[PDB]
Design a protein around this motif. Structure first.
Motif, mmCIF file in Angstrom:
data_model
loop_
_atom_site.group_PDB
_atom_site.id
_atom_site.type_symbol
_atom_site.label_atom_id
_atom_site.label_comp_id
_atom_site.label_asym_id
_atom_site.label_seq_id
_atom_site.Cartn_x
_atom_site.Cartn_y
_atom_site.Cartn_z
ATOM 1 N N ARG D 78 0.826 -1.197 0.000
ATOM 2 C CA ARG D 78 0.000 0.000 0.000
ATOM 3 C C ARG D 78 0.862 1.249 0.000
ATOM 4 N NH1 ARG D 78 -3.013 -1.591 3.869
ATOM 5 N NH2 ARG D 78 -2.178 -0.238 5.520
ATOM 6 N N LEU D 79 1.935 1.245 0.789
ATOM 7 C CA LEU D 79 2.834 2.391 0.830
ATOM 8 C C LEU D 79 3.741 2.448 -0.386
ATOM 9 C CD1 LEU D 79 3.778 2.056 4.576
ATOM 10 C CD2 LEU D 79 2.413 3.891 3.597
ATOM 11 N N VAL D 80 4.067 1.297 -0.977
ATOM 12 C CA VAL D 80 4.811 1.306 -2.231
ATOM 13 C C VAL D 80 3.971 1.924 -3.341
ATOM 14 C CG1 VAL D 80 5.774 -0.163 -4.020
ATOM 15 C CG2 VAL D 80 6.384 -0.553 -1.670
ATOM 16 N N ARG D 81 2.691 1.541 -3.419
ATOM 17 C CA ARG D 81 1.822 1.953 -4.519
ATOM 18 C C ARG D 81 1.651 3.464 -4.589
ATOM 19 N NH1 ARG D 81 -4.071 -0.629 -6.053
ATOM 20 N NH2 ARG D 81 -4.809 0.206 -4.049
ATOM 21 N N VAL D 82 1.536 4.134 -3.442
ATOM 22 C CA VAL D 82 1.411 5.587 -3.447
ATOM 23 C C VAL D 82 2.752 6.285 -3.586
ATOM 24 C CG1 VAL D 82 -0.732 5.617 -2.157
ATOM 25 C CG2 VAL D 82 1.437 5.611 -0.949
ATOM 26 N N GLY D 83 3.857 5.552 -3.509
ATOM 27 C CA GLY D 83 5.156 6.147 -3.746
ATOM 28 C C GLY D 83 5.775 6.874 -2.578
ATOM 29 N N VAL D 84 5.400 6.531 -1.351
ATOM 30 C CA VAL D 84 6.041 7.090 -0.172
ATOM 31 C C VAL D 84 7.200 6.218 0.298
ATOM 32 C CG1 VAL D 84 3.951 8.296 0.499
ATOM 33 C CG2 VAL D 84 4.353 6.024 1.361
ATOM 34 N N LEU D 85 7.115 4.910 0.075
ATOM 35 C CA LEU D 85 8.240 4.019 0.307
ATOM 36 C C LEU D 85 8.939 3.775 -1.021
ATOM 37 C CD1 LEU D 85 9.124 2.836 2.997
ATOM 38 C CD2 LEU D 85 8.161 0.656 2.286
ATOM 39 N N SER D 86 10.264 3.885 -1.027
ATOM 40 C CA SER D 86 10.990 3.817 -2.283
ATOM 41 C C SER D 86 11.006 2.389 -2.819
ATOM 42 C CB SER D 86 12.414 4.338 -2.123
ATOM 43 O OG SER D 86 13.212 3.429 -1.400
ATOM 44 N N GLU D 87 11.518 2.260 -4.049
ATOM 45 C CA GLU D 87 11.265 1.083 -4.881
ATOM 46 C C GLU D 87 11.783 -0.194 -4.239
ATOM 47 O OE1 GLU D 87 9.451 1.658 -7.592
ATOM 48 O OE2 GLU D 87 9.506 3.813 -7.187
ATOM 49 N N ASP D 88 12.986 -0.153 -3.675
ATOM 50 C CA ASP D 88 13.433 -1.206 -2.766
ATOM 51 C C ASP D 88 13.883 -0.524 -1.483
ATOM 52 O OD1 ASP D 88 13.940 -4.354 -3.130
ATOM 53 O OD2 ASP D 88 15.399 -3.534 -1.711
ATOM 54 N N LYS D 89 12.931 -0.366 -0.568
ATOM 55 C CA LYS D 89 13.178 -0.034 0.825
ATOM 56 C C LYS D 89 12.268 -0.914 1.675
ATOM 57 C CE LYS D 89 15.529 2.890 1.138
ATOM 58 N NZ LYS D 89 15.275 4.322 1.454
ATOM 59 N N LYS D 90 11.745 -1.970 1.060
ATOM 60 C CA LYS D 90 10.551 -2.672 1.520
ATOM 61 C C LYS D 90 10.896 -3.530 2.726
ATOM 62 C CE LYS D 90 9.018 -4.793 -2.028
ATOM 63 N NZ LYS D 90 8.724 -5.340 -3.379
ATOM 64 N N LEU D 92 9.950 -3.514 7.282
ATOM 65 C CA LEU D 92 9.211 -2.868 8.362
ATOM 66 C C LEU D 92 10.102 -1.967 9.199
ATOM 67 C CD1 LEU D 92 6.953 -4.958 7.603
ATOM 68 C CD2 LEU D 92 6.589 -5.172 10.031
ATOM 69 N N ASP D 93 11.416 -2.162 9.132
ATOM 70 C CA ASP D 93 12.327 -1.234 9.779
ATOM 71 C C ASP D 93 12.439 0.076 9.025
ATOM 72 O OD1 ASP D 93 12.909 -2.957 11.876
ATOM 73 O OD2 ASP D 93 14.541 -3.921 10.778
ATOM 74 N N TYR D 94 11.917 0.154 7.803
ATOM 75 C CA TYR D 94 12.036 1.387 7.042
ATOM 76 C C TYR D 94 10.738 2.172 6.959
ATOM 77 C CZ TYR D 94 16.468 -0.498 5.399
ATOM 78 O OH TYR D 94 17.722 -1.051 5.319
ATOM 79 N N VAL D 95 9.588 1.539 7.207
ATOM 80 C CA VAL D 95 8.360 2.309 7.346
ATOM 81 C C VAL D 95 8.362 3.094 8.646
ATOM 82 C CG1 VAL D 95 7.086 0.680 5.942
ATOM 83 C CG2 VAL D 95 7.072 0.426 8.393
ATOM 84 N N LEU D 96 9.154 2.673 9.628
ATOM 85 C CA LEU D 96 9.302 3.452 10.844
ATOM 86 C C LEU D 96 10.195 4.659 10.622
ATOM 87 C CD1 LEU D 96 9.456 0.486 13.278
ATOM 88 C CD2 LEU D 96 7.596 2.009 12.787
ATOM 89 N N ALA D 97 11.139 4.562 9.689
ATOM 90 C CA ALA D 97 11.952 5.712 9.328
ATOM 91 C C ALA D 97 11.226 6.667 8.400
ATOM 92 C CB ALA D 97 13.250 5.250 8.670
ATOM 93 N N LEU D 98 10.024 6.312 7.964
ATOM 94 C CA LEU D 98 9.262 7.145 7.051
ATOM 95 C C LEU D 98 8.805 8.409 7.762
ATOM 96 C CD1 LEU D 98 8.224 6.970 4.164
ATOM 97 C CD2 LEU D 98 6.200 5.855 5.028
ATOM 98 N N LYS D 99 9.050 9.559 7.151
ATOM 99 C CA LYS D 99 8.793 10.840 7.790
ATOM 100 C C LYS D 99 7.745 11.614 6.998
ATOM 101 C CE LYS D 99 12.921 12.798 7.503
ATOM 102 N NZ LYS D 99 13.915 13.856 7.830
#
Lengths: 144, 46, 134, 185
Positions: D78-90, D92-99
């Motif tokens: 869901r977060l990949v599709r809207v483009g807030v998480l980068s193409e390979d950052k997939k 759960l340790d990186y959705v917490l770094a999401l600002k």
RNA sequence: GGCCUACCAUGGUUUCAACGGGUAACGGGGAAUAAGGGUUCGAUUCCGGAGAGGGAGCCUGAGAAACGGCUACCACAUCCAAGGAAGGCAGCAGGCGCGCAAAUUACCCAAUCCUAAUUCAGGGAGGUAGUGACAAUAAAUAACGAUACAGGGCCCAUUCGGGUCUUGUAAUUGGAAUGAGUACAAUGUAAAUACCUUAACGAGGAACAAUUGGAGGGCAAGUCUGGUGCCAGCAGCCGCGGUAAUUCCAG
């Protein structure tokens, strides 16, 4: 140690001991004695309407030396007589005897505020309009 | 004394203020355009 | 007003109600709206239903314009399009006549008045008229 | 006695009301993105705080938990599709770094500006709500549209809008009208 | 089934709180607050219970101790020809009263379903509209441009200059875009209103003009000016005001 029981079959003692020591709490007692219903001038309400009986001047306590320009009011639903402060200047001219004012708490949940001794209430509306409007000349007091 | 308070001079200062009228000025922008004015006016240092 | 395109989606045949039912999807890219009457004309041509076996009722223009979607019915043998249509949807198309009656207030007030009498009522009207006459 | 309508609020006011750090951290989020008010910023951090609560819940659970695996990929894709998480950052340790920054990038009020054609980030806001930009075939006038990854080729002027053709609007139409009645005849 | 009766026995409950009292107590699903643990609320969209001014008693029926059924009262209360008769809005709408505190005596069975002898009739159940800043969602109040003064630091300098680097003040102008609204139409709808569409009008500071509280500290933002002089007042708290008030009243 630690002065309270700890055994696994001792929940009754801890529960009854918490109950007895809850009564030392100020607002737990008033919630379970119904002090708002019986003892407070408003019947546990935010607001109450009244009837103005006289204009009062109360000396401000130390270290202030002003005269506070409050009124004495008798409530409709209770008949009790309370003293209520009339806010910023000229509003005592806008209030007269028998204007059927509306009262609110004075901020401190049943305590006096500032240098005024023994006043726990303030007037919000006089003759049913406002005091802000009358002070700012936004509305006019009805001819009564 | 300690019986009464002199209610005579209620409003004695607001009555005697030498009132002056609010000068007409051009209106300020509202909504998102006000944050533009605000958050450039706090950051004009080029 | 260049063109309108009638696209009929989700076509379901309904033998036991003697009708065909579908989703009408009209694409009017320059018209304001599409006005159901000439939809009934144009849906008649593609189904051979003489404008009285058809019905369109539920149209909603999409946001931004240029497209509207609604429902549509096509009946067999127009005599069966009056058997199964609601009366309110026939009077839109002029097949049925708007039946005239008083409001619910008067229709209920009359029933309560007529609930007081017992019988024909003209036994009592004869005996009260002679007291009013004399 | 009809069943209730569910509703909820989509923002949260910060605890301490008057800061100089948070109050001036709105330099980016209100002037550099062209926003109405702080509720548009409080809205983003609410969803972003909603994301981390689910992610923290999953990380506590065991790896190769079927619940962790199912709602994990769902939260990522869901977060990949809207483009807030980068193409390979997939992870759960990186959705917490999401600002908060890479949410306001995906807004249509900025994605219009980054894809040319706007010349300001709050010239774009005016154009969107004046019914000028359409995505695919659909006119949108919501500046918080949060475009997807397969949609940036479809931000373009509307087929109805004057800048996409279609007989320019009532200002130029009337302005050309008075020269017709003054110069034409 | 002590449910009641006759006979008989003396049992039954309780400090692990019986019994009594209070509750501004219908119970639950649930709500608010959110580290964990908890605290507070739940008359109220669903389930269960109870009640129809109070209390009894009953007819009919499969089902009622029914109250938009019947038999008399009391906070009661209606009509008159004075003899008698009739009543129960904690259904819908409305009124009075009470209060800090809460909407229209509107339209309709078209949807959801219910009942009947029943496809058709009926339904203030229910739906639609009016009132509605209870809460909740989305987001107008402008966008692009063009145009200028007044300094200050430093550098080179003839001294008259630039040539950067920054500080403030606007102020006159231009074409573009749009809906808030006014509305042909169509759509929507049981019929309408409104939304979503859409012909025709609809922006230049005078408006189509955003307010509510603040500027000592907590706590973001003036030791600027005029008035007052421990007065008026402010101030949740500490405090401010007695003739230079960053705190009152004003711009």
């Amino acid at each position: 140690g630690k002065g309270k029981p700890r055994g696994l079959n001792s929940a009754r003692k801890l529960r009854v001991h918490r109950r007895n020591n809850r009564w030392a709490e100020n607002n737990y007692k008033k919630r379970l004695l119904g002090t708002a219903f019986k003892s407070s001038p408003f019947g546990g309400s935010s607001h109450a309407k009244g009837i103005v009986l006289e204009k009062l001047g109360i000396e401000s306590k130390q270290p202030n030396s002003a005269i506070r320009k409050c009124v004495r009011v008798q409530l409709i639903k209770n008949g009790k007589k309370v003293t209520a402060f009339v806010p910023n200047d000229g509003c005592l001219n806008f209030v007269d005897e028998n204007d059927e004012v509306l009262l609110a708490g004075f901020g401190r949940k049943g305590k006096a505020k500032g240098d005024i001794p023994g006043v726990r209430f303030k007037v919000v509306k006089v003759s049913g309009v406002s005091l802000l409007a009358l002070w700012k000349e936004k509305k006019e007091k009805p001819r009564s | 004394a300690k019986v009464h308070g002199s209610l005579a001079r209620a409003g004695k200062v607001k009555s005697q203020t030498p009132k002056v009228e609010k000068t007409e000025k051009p209106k300020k922008p509202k909504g998102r355009a006000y944050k533009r004015l605000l958050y450039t006016r706090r950051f004009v240092n080029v | 007003s260049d063109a309108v395109t009638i696209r009929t989606r989700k076509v379901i045949s309904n033998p036991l109600l003697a009708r065909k039912q579908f989703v009408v999807d009209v694409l009017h890219p320059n018209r304001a709206n599409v006005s159901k009457d000439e939809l009934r004309e144009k849906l008649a041509e593609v189904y051979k239903a003489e404008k009285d076996a058809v019905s369109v009722f539920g149209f909603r223009t999409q946001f931004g314009g240029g497209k509207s979607v609604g429902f549509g019915l096509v009946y067999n043998s127009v005599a069966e399009a009056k058997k199964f249509e609601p009366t309110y949807r026939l009077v839109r198309y002029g097949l049925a006549e708007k039946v005239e009656k008083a409001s619910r207030q008067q229709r209920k007030q009359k029933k309560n008045r007529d609930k007081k009498i017992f019988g024909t009522g003209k036994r009592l009207a004869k005996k009260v008229a002679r007291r009013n006459a004399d | 006695p009809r069943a209730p309508r569910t509703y909820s609020k989509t923002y949260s006011t910060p605890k301490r009301p008057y800061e100089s750090s948070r109050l001036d951290a709105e330099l980016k989020l209100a002037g550099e993105f062209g926003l109405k008010n702080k509720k548009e910023i409080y809205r983003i951090s609410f969803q972003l705080s909603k994301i981390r609560r689910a992610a923290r819940d999953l990380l506590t659970r065991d790896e190769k938990d079927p619940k962790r695996l199912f709602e994990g990929n769902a939260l990522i894709r869901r977060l990949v599709r809207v483009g807030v998480l980068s193409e390979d950052k997939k992870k759960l340790d990186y959705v917490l770094a999401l600002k908060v920054e890479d949410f306001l990038e995906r807004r249509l009020q900025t994605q219009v500006y980054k894809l040319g054609l706007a010349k300001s980030v709050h010239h774009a806001r005016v154009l969107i709500t004046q019914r000028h930009i359409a995505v695919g075939k659909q006119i949108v006038n919501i500046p918080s549209f949060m475009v997807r990854l397969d949609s940036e080729k479809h931000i373009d002027f509307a087929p109805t809008s004057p800048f996409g053709g279609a007989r320019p609007g009532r200002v130029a139409r009337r302005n050309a009208a008075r020269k017709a009645e003054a110069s034409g005849e």
